[PDB]
Design a protein around this nucleic acid. Structure first.
Lengths: 96, 164, 168, 169
RNA sequence: GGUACGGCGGCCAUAGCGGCGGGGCCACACCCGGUCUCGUUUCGACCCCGGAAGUUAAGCCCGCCAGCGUUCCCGGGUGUACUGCCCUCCGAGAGGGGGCGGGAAACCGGGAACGCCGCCGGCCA
RNA sequence: GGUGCCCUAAGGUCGGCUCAGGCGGGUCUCCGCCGUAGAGUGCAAGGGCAAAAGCCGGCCUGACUGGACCCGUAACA
RNA sequence: GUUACUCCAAAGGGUGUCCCUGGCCUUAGACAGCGG
């Protein structure tokens, strides 16, 4: 029996949280700042359901290209296609 | 604790000093904050801004340096901080009160009144403000019959004529 | 019932969850300890497997009955402690035919999975019934789908099988 | 063992017990589906309203349905409680049984339907003591727990109750 | 320069639970009362308002403790279990082996560990 | 293993408060205590959630209008 | 047996022979024969 893809499919470990985080993250993440050309990691915080992209791209690295609202625009490479996301900065993490 | 899977809350929550949800809603505003705190015998009023390593305090105030814990002193503290911070050069702010609940008729909102009258721009409403017959002191000058507005007024004159 | 070569091997995932297996059978063997349970015997005698096995509860109960009868008539209850170490959790499957349309076995039985150099049984005994202990072990070894070997452990958990065999 | 509250007073009263409060209730419950008039009784008795207390999970005997008031409870502090106690202790028989006390310094009269100090009541009367600075385990700001070197036990409570009115068994 | 003071914070158990010894001008607390600002499906117990008659007993502050929990290091367990590539290696087969590279978890013995770092004050001189 | 629905609140926000279970009292809903959530969430499973996303209340109807861009179904394509 | 793999039998047994290891014996040992 086949099964389409959907947001929360096979997310039992990827979107599970360690039993010792369990609540809000520290507030040094909602207020992260980023510049253009800055490379970022896509790492999802399961407690915040706003600005969360498809978990398909959990663990990938992209580049910032702009800003819309309180969200940042991110480009990733998927094979040879470019894909653009609007992500809240609690789901992101700077390189180095 | 009692083993793994036990979650040991943040320290300032554990102690009972800080609400992190409210903190987040306030930080999302990138304006400076006006922290007003109350105790049994004193009233504190600071100006704070955010740094990732720890909130930096620009201007402060204390009822002791004033005298050199009620609504009149709250108002005068507000006046003091409003003249100090506009001199520092920050003509905007927003109120933080912490874990004190909002009740109309409180020395915290009298601090707000003072900081406004001293000329600092702070969004608010003109309905929580206590009434001036509690401001000046007529409440205690009425309890007297079952501190004087003389002193309140000439002290107000001191503060203004010195921070002109 | 059907031969044991069909269920000997281990090359197959585990199937141990009764809160998902519909119609899972129930155990036949319900006694795993015998003799003097409170005890301080001298010599310990255990079977180890020579390779991974998958042993049915039919076989376990056969072993139990035989060995216990033998030792009850040749040793006596206050002088031996007999234990079976392994419980049957693995559910066995059989295809009910339709042919090979919708093949997925309905459950028939249970088995214990055992890895290489694992213990299966144990007889604790004094020094003047070792002959009987080893006869029991022969009888048991004879009823298993693959081979097995025995040792003789001391308290302090040390191997003394050679020093004991050479002198008896 | 009176040396206990002897030491209470010795150190200074900061470690002295007292009555935090009193409460009174219809315990065995007699309204079922009604809102009775012992409602009115208790008010006549003391002089401040009684507090209804609605049902719970559908029961078998006492309150076999939810949401229906069945009982009543009230709370006294300050001097009302001291005073109301002064009649009630005289009303019960003397040499009170520690076997109804609490292992932490409290108690709750078993006795039902006795009238003293000037028809149907079935009733249960509970007391609560505490040293003074208990405020901090209630107040929001900097709330935390209370150690054992400041809590109570059976013995201190017994000797404190013995201090006025009834002696004990 | 001094403090057995304080407010706002960051890392969020190496900080937690429990246990003990000591301290109180200035400050935080517990306290007395509450008409009014506020309210308790009923009580100034909670919260809000004004003072301090009393004390440090509790919370706070200084110091220590390895009973439980967490984290890091030293030896063992052990180069064990499992593993990527190659093989005209073994074996009836199931499955194992050799060479080149990576490499645990339990458990044992011994250490440390009963929080670290920012900004601003207040008062004594 | 479940859906082919239900809800003017079970929808928006503001404030206050904490759960199941047990121990110890009182009789056949009352006081105190321990309690990392072992409860509850409109409905399955998984995930999330404690000064709360749970319970108690007060005020409302963003379950609106005109329009852009991007992710999935349908990886790469 | 003369089979890399394609295409090839087990559990259970053996003073058949060639080897490793560890106990007990030994200047009278382990069999025999002569008698108690």
């Amino acid at each position: 029996v086949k099964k389409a893809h959907s947001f929360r499919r096979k997310t039992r470990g990827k979107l599970s949280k360690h039993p010792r985080r369990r609540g809000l993250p520290p507030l040094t993440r909602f207020l992260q700042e980023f510049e253009v050309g800055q490379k970022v990691h896509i790492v999802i915080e399961p407690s915040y359901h706003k600005g969360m992209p498809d978990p398909r791209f959990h663990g990938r690295t992209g580049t910032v290209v702009g800003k819309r609202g309180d969200a940042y625009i991110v480009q990733i490479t998927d094979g040879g296609k470019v894909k653009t996301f609007f992500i809240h900065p609690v789901h992101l993490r700077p390189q180095k | 604790a009692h083993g793994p899977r036990y979650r040991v809350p943040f320290r300032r929550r554990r102690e009972g000093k800080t609400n992190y949800h409210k903190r987040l809603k306030l930080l999302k505003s990138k304006k400076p904050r006006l922290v007003v705190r109350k105790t049994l015998n004193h009233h504190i009023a600071q100006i704070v801004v955010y740094d990732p390593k720890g909130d930096k305090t620009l201007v402060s105030a204390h009822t002791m340096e004033l005298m050199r814990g009620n609504t009149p002193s709250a108002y005068l503290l507000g006046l003091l901080i409003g003249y100090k911070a506009k001199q520092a050069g920050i003509e905007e702010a927003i109120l933080d009160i912490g874990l004190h609940p909002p009740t109309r008729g409180s020395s915290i909102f009298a601090v707000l009144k003072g900081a406004v009258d001293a000329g600092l721009n702070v969004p608010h409403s003109e309905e929580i403000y206590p009434e001036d017959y509690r401001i000046n002191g007529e409440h205690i000058a009425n309890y007297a019959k079952a501190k004087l507005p003389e002193h309140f007024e000439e002290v107000k004159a001191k503060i203004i004529e010195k921070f002109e | 019932l059907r031969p044991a070569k069909i269920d000997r091997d281990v090359d197959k995932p585990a199937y141990t969850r009764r809160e998902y297996i519909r119609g899972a059978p129930g155990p036949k063997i319900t006694i795993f300890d015998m003799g003097n349970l409170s005890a301080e015997f001298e010599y310990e005698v255990s079977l180890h497997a020579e390779q991974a096995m998958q042993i049915r509860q039919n076989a376990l109960e056969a072993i139990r009955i035989q060995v216990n009868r033998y030792l009850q008539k040749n040793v006596g209850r206050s002088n031996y402690h007999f234990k079976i170490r392994v419980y049957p959790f693995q559910v066995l499957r059989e295809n009910p035919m339709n042919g090979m349309r919708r093949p997925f076995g309905k459950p028939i039985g249970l088995a214990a999975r055992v890895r290489k150099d694992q213990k299966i049984l144990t007889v604790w005994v004094n020094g003047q019934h070792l002959k009987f202990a080893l006869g029991a072990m022969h009888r048991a070894k004879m009823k298993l789908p693959y081979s097995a070997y025995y040792r003789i452990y001391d308290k302090e958990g040390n191997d003394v099988t050679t020093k004991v065999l050479s002198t008896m | 063992n009176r040396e206990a509250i002897l030491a209470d007073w010795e150190a200074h009263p900061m470690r002295k017990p007292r009555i935090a409060k009193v409460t009174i209730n219809i315990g065995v419950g007699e309204s079922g589906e009604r809102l009775t008039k012992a409602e009115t009784m208790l008010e006549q008795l003391v002089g401040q309203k009684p507090i209804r207390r609605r049902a719970k999970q559908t029961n078998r005997d006492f309150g076999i349905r939810r949401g229906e008031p069945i009982a009543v409870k009230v709370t006294l502090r300050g001097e009302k409680a001291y005073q109301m106690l002064d009649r009630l202790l005289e009303a019960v028989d003397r040499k009170l049984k520690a076997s109804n006390f609490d292992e932490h310094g409290n108690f709750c009269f078993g006795i039902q339907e006795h009238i003293n100090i000037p028809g149907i009541f079935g009733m249960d009367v509970c007391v609560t003591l505490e040293r003074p600075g208990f405020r901090v385990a209630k107040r929001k700001r900097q709330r935390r727990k209370i150690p054992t070197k400041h809590k109570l036990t059976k013995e201190e409570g017994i000797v404190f109750a013995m201090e006025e009115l009834k002696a004990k068994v």
